[model samples]
Target: TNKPIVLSTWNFGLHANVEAWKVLSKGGKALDAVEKGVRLVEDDPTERSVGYGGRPDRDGRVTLDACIMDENYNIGSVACMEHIKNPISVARAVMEKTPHVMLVGDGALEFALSQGFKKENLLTAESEKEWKEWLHDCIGMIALDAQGNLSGACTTSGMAYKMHGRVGDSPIIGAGLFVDNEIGAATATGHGEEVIRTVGTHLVVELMNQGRTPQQACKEAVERIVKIVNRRGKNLKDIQVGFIALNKKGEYGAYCIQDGFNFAVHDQKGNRLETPGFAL
Candidate 1:
């Protein structure tokens, strides 16, 4: 049997992985581990790119996006939601309690409230100050449990000072996050536009299904993005797109379009940060 493992995108994932380890080490469900893991980032007041304390839209409103998926293929998502503290949890609720796979704007907020989620001011003084001055980023997590099940979660407040209703890949199931318990799971970070255009995470998982190692699958995904951007005559200078993947065999890998991308990994050996190879 494969040992339990958890992986998340970005440096903030260090703390998030610790939280997931608490559950994975206990033989808990991957679904539970991923949710608990990302909740830490969503609740962190110091994080200005997700949930509370996140930068606001051009109109000065803080909208959130998130999605969750379990081994059974049950998926839930929210986009352009506002005032909710934990959109990941709300995403799970949608999966378990509703027939819909996604909710957006006022509908998402209404569903969250109906599920007993408290409404609060998500835009903190720090985030507001930054908005007044000037973002797109997200925390995406994937976990493998002792039973070999795979699950994933992704959350973000989207690009700072973006158009009021702009929704990034964070809340899109196949773009920001994808899990296939029989094959593997994958998640993405960086340019949501590029990720969405390629259905990034899903592409990674499909590549793994086609017999590519986790690392190869991630690399191929990044390469595809690079080719697409080049074909479009777009400058690759600042277009960052990263893909992290883990197979059911417990092997993992990550690749990105830029040099600075990183991910966090946690297993029996302990949690640590990893810098993956880049396409640049």
Candidate 2:
């Protein structure tokens, strides 16, 4: 336990930086620590996905959602947070601060900032452009610690300039996040709405627990997700999902339905390996 390794699903965005800190602080199992770290991004408005300060809808205002799970408990969370930018923190609060496992919209934000979370602007011109062009919400994450516990989280600013009050799966627990000490943990990213509809991240780990390796679980998990493109026959790329987890021996695994993803792992030597996608 002296050395810890953090394995998170593909997500090399600005917010993914939080994983390093949690590993330094909590080394026993990378699953809970890394996931809780990702939650920090989701819960803070400054990070732009979960809580607040993201691009407004076509009207101009931000909304967010996020979730997290741990091996200590079969935690679940879903938040429709607004006005604040981090839904992950609200999710943790729902886990550590309150009896509830989930909160929605403005209500989630209200509770999070009240706990002393600073509010700020969480949008970039590039993210705005991505929103307008794609019309698809970019949000998802999965982390697995050494304990074999798999946890997942997702976040979104919602449809760039669309409905003013929309929420996505990044904040739904079990649906978007899940952890199982006996099996593995997983986090997901991609269209949060669709993932939630498919009961996304949770589905991955459950498959692994049922005798699937991290690889098998990922493949099967994606199959379970009915993509908007395929279902609509739009010739669009199917919804992509990313995953990460550890087995009983602490071997880490990761996969993405698309090209690549980034992750950091601290090994038995107390050094870190920066591997992208499921390659390492």
Candidate 3:
């Protein structure tokens, strides 16, 4: 049997995986595990890049974006939403309760309220202060449960001080996150625009389906980004994109466009943070 494993992007992912481990260790579903894990980060006020304390847009509004995916190909998403602290949960609700794959802005908030989610000011004093001064990140997580099912989630407030109503790859399926239970799952972080242009996570998962190892798949995706950026004559130095993946066998790997990207991993062995090799 494949052992339970969970992985996520960045330092906060370390804490997120700890929560996910509680679910995976107990034989919970990967879908539930990923939601439970990401919720922790969403609830943390100090994280600043996600959930309650996320930085605001240029107009000082804290609009959030998030998405969730399950092994069965079910997915949900919300973007450009305000006043709801846990967009990930709302995304889950969209998947389970609504026929639509995504909801946005006031419509998303309306749906959330109809589903019994409370309305609250998501902007914090800290986030507001940062907005006045300047801001950004997404947390993309993937997990494999004891039953060997795979699931993924991605959440973010998007680029700090961006134009109002801007939506990044976080809430988009096949860009920020993708899962194929028979093959593997993948999630992307960094520049959402680049990720969207390349349909990054989906490419990674498809590469795995085509017989590439988890590491090779992630690397190839990053390579694709580099090739596109170069062809466009864009400065690679200003762009950063990272991908993390886990196969059905419980094997996992990560890669990025630059040296600073890192990820968190948790399995039967233990939990730790790792910096993946970069394409640059």
Candidate 4:
């Protein structure tokens, strides 16, 4: 029997690829399995654009974003945090902690540190360059359980060198994270501003819940953004948003509003395929 191992690689493709392979190969539960796989990226030092070596805040220090939502509807998240090593665990902590839905900036860092999460320098020379190269963007990845009971999570350092307290979609429910048991789980990447304005990931799942295919749902979500208002109070170009999804039967799907992205998908037999953007 082939088990499922689908993962998003919008950031740190190798790290995410390695992690998801580990979980699926071990026959782990899809939910824990997916987060564990992503956690590997968060812990790895070599992988920039995710975990360590990601985008920095106003002071050029790297913060992190992470979220987790399960089949039973347990969701946790932390965002724009510096030092806290594993943002994903912090997200799970949020889920297990208070009733608050989100935490950010210094406050989020302090809370994650108190929870026994180790802190590290999340920035590297390479990521420093990437942050400067692009400003208004969002990046994240996700994994789904075999039953296609979908849950999505995202982790990021947030927008580069923006306002002192600027936040992104990485910690917002329905934006960076969303789960719909009836349709599928969807995780997104690209254009945080657009995601914040439209909540693209949640919209996709909602469309799927309404009986649309993952691809169709993704298209509509993208279309919705073009049709909506922008932060600057002007209709903008179609924003870049990407998604990876798993259906109710362990099947996979993915789409992007822009050029493309990278992803990894595995089956019970350990057949692993790493790709850029859309797939089954």
The lDDT for every candidate, in the order shown, is 0.92, 0.56, 0.93, 0.66
Give lDDT tens digits, candidate 2, residues 48-105. Answer: 4444435566545566666666666645454445555555555666788787777776
Candidate that scores best on lDDT: 3
Candidate 3 lDDT score relative to the true structure: 0.93
Weakest 10 consecutive residues, lDDT, candidate 1? Answer: 127-136
Q: In model 2, which regions exceed 4 Å deviation?
A: 1-3, 11-32, 39-53, 74-78, 121-154, 226-238, 260-266, 269-280
Write model 3 residue lDDT over 1-280, tens digit each, in one string.
Answer: 4579999999989999999999999999999889999899899889888988888889998899999999999999999999998999999999999989999999999999999999988888877777777743889999999888999999999998989999999999999999999999999999899999999999999999999999999999999999999999999999999999999999999999999889999998899999898998
Candidate 4 local lDDT, 132-166, one digit each (tens): 67552433555554444455567766666766566
**What TM-score do all the candidates reach, one by one?**
0.98, 0.73, 0.98, 0.82
Query: Model 1: per-residue lDDT, tens digit, 1-280?
Result: 4579999999999999999999999999999999999999899878988888788899999999999999999999999999998999999999999999999999999999999999999988887787777733889999999999999999999988889999899999889999998999999998788899999999999999999999999999999999999999998986999989999988999999899888999988888999999988
- Where model 3 places Cα greater than 4 Å from the true spot, the runs are none
Candidate 2, lDDT over the whole model: 0.56
